Amino acid sequence: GKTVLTCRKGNGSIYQVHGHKRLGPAKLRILDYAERHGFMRGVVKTIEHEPGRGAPLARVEFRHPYKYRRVKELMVAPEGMFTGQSVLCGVKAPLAIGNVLPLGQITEGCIVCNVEAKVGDRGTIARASGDYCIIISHNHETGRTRLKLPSGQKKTVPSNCRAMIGIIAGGGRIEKPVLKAGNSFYRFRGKRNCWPKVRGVARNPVEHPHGGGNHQHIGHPSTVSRHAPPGQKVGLIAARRTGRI
């Protein structure tokens, strides 16, 4: 045959993220001693658009814990995070929007964003716009809170894990129809060479497992096995069910 496009994206050549104009990683502050035994006040300096990203990123400027210099630092913004706002990261941070305080100290039922799964990893869950995760339980005896991932998905993480308070900003992007082929041209301009998506049945038999034939049709089930070798694992992958739900 010939290499499938799903496999070629793994070369990550043409298919790499753009990101020249990206501001850098949008993370939480390094889990300092100050985070673990107090709090760091950083004022939000400016809320930026990172191209290719939905959520605005904030520019909180924490003062450096150990030296005379000030440490501007960039994290995806919770909604209502205005410039000049004083963020408070740390274990005994007050419970407010934008504050980053230990997950086990956040009240059960309150919704948090930019949650970190592993302790100290600097915020990986609930980072996309509009996204958040409600804390659904604490377990102080074993120090592991549960939380509901932005997908209907429960997950247990240590309470020492940081989280930010509130919904991530920029929510509701997806609600607006794109309408133009050109409009989606630009949302992916800042993302990657993801787009346009040619259908595999429109492709040739060399190009794709679905490709080829006179009427353009898949010839075999589109629901591929989990163990299917790459270049084969196209169509619906390890699908448990198909059909509209």
Partner RNA sequence: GAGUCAAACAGACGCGCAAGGGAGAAGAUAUCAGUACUUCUCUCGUACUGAAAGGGAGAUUGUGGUGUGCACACUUGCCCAACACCGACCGGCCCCGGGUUGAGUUGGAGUGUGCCUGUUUGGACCCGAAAGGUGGUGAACUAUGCCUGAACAAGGUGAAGCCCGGGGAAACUCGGGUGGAGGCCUGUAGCGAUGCUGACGUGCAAAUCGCUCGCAUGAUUUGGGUAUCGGAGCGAAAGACUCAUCGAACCACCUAGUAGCUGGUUCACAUCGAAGUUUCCCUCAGGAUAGCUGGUGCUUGAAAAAGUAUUGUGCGGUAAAGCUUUAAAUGUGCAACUUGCCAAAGCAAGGUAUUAAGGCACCAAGUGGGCCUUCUUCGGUAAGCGGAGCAGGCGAUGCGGAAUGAACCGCUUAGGGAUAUGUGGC
Partner RNA sequence: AGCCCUUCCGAUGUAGAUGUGGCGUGGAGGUAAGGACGAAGCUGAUGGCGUGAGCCUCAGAUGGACCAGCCUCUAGUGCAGAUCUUGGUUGGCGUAGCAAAGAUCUAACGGAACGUUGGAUACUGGAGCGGGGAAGGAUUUCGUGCCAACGGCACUCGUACACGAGUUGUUCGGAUACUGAGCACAACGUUACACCGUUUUUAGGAAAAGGGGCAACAGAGAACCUGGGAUUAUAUUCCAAAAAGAAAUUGCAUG
Partner RNA sequence: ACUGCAGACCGUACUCAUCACCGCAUCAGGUCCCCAAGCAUACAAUGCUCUGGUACAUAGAGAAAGGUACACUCAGGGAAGUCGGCAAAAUAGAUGCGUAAGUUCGCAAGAAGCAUUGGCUCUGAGGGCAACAACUCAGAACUGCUUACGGCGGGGAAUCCAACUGUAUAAUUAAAACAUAGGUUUGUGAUGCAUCCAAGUGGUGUAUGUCGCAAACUGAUUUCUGCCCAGUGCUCUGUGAAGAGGUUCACCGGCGCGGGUAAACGGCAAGGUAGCCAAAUGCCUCGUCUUCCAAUUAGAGACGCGCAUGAAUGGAUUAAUGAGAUUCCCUCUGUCCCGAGUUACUAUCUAGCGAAACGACAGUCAAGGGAACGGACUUGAAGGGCUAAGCGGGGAAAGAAGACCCUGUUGAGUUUGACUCCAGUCUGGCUCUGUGAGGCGAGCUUCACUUAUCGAAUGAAGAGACCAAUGGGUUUCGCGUAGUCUGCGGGCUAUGCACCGUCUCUGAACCAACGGAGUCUUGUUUCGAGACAUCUGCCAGAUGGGGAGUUUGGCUGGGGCGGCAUAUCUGUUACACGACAACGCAGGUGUCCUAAGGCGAGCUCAGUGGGAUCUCACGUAGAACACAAGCGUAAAAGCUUGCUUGAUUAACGAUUUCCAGUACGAAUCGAGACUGCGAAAGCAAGGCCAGCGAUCCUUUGCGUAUGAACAAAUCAUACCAGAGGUGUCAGAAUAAUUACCACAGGGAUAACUGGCUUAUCCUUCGAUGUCGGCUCUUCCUAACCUAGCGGCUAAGGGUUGGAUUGUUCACCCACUGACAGGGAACGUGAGCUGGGUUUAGACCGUCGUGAGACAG
Partner RNA sequence: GUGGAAAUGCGGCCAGGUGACCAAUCAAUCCUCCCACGGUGAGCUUUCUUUUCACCAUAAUCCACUUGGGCCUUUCGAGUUGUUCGGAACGGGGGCUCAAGAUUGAAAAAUGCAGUUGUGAGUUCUAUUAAAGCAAAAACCUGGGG
Residue 16 assigned as binding residue: no
Identified binder of RNA from the candidate list 117, 134, 136, 146, rule CB under 7 A: 117
Q: Do 81 and 71 meet the contact criterion of CB atoms below 8 Å apart?
A: no
Which residues, including other chains, have CB under 8 Å from residue 187's CB and lie 6 or more apart? 52, 178
- Per rule CB under 7 A, is residue 103 in the interface with RNA? no
Q: Give the footprint of Mg ion on residues 166-225 (CB under 5 A).
A: 217
* Euclidean distance between CA atoms 60 and 73, whole angstroms: 5
Least distance in angstroms from the C-beta of 109 to RNA = 18
* 3-class secondary structure, 48: strand
Least Å from the CB of residue 163 to RNA: 12
Q: Which of residues 18-57 bind RNA (CB under 7 A)?
A: 18-27, 30-34, 36-37, 43-45, 48-49, 51-55
Instruction: Out of 1, 24, 25, 230, point to the residue binding Mg ion (CB under 5 A).
Output: 1
Q: Which two tokens stand for residue 48?
A: 């930026």
Count CB neighbours of 174 within 10 A.
11
Structure tokens at 127: 């980072």
User: Which region among 1-9, 32-40, 50-58, 122-130 touches Mg ion (by CB under 5 A)?
Assistant: 1-9
Site for RNA in 167-196 (CB under 7 A): 168, 170-187, 189-196
Contact 147, 133 (CB under 8 A): yes
